[PDB]
Amino acid sequence: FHSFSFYELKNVTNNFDERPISVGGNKMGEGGFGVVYKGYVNNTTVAVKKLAAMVDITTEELKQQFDQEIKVMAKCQHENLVELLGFSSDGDDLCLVYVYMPNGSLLDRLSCLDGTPPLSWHMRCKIAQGAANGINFLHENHHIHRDIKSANILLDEAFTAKISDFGLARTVMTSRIVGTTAYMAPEALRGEITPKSDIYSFGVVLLEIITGLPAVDEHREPQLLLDIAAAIEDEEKTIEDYIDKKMNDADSTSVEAMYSVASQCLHEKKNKRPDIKKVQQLLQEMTA
């Protein structure tokens, strides 16, 4: 953990080059709170998050998420969480520096962005167990993520799942209702802050993992992935019809076992949902 010159981060990202790595630029992805650039510092490839209000948030609310992420992650080293290497606040923009995740986001690999080969059912099961172990660590330390989704699950050199984005990290009620609507529990939309919302959001991730479909697709009927889950439960559809066809190693038993965990996670009444420990156990028994 260090403080970095804004100019070092500016320099090693080719002046925050917004062109893709494919074109030859430095932009790897973006979110509601800024753009992720590929950089090289301390003889290592790194990820540089340049923070900016790409959405209706205050510049002080941006600075809150910056300080909040540093407070939570500065000294954190878990197998299934991203590692923060440092920050920059001495220049034009606020920057967070992380250990580079070569295989990017679960979202991107599920969509096969840039022509990457589809993830095997084997890799998917290990990723699900990884992410859950990452969430368990947060919940054990009485932290609520508040934005669990496939874009906030990153993949290292061995496709180990790392949870990312702790700007919003925190039964309790709030007036500022923040998150990703495609993933959000009903009570989270009403402004509740509970780890039970994280479980619901994880349910949607498991659906993404089983189906290979994004949580929302404006060109799709239905548009929201959690409505496909509802339709399955009302027997209007079946899980077999929606299992990602881009796998050769998926067996109905383990797929339906994962769907079972997802379905329990997506109970609309938060108190009916399993806790993360119970999700971990059920995902363990799935591969036994």
Ligand SMILES: COc1cc2c(cc1NC(=O)c1cccc(C(C)(C)O)n1)CN(CCS(C)(=O)=O)N2
């Ligand atoms: C979107 O963020 C990334 C995208 C991509 C890659 C890395 C990242 N991101 C991080 O490495 C990182 C680490 C920690 C934290 C974060 C934040 C998000 C800032 O929280 N990001 C790599 N990559 C190439 C994949 S390929 C060779 O299969 O085509 N795409």
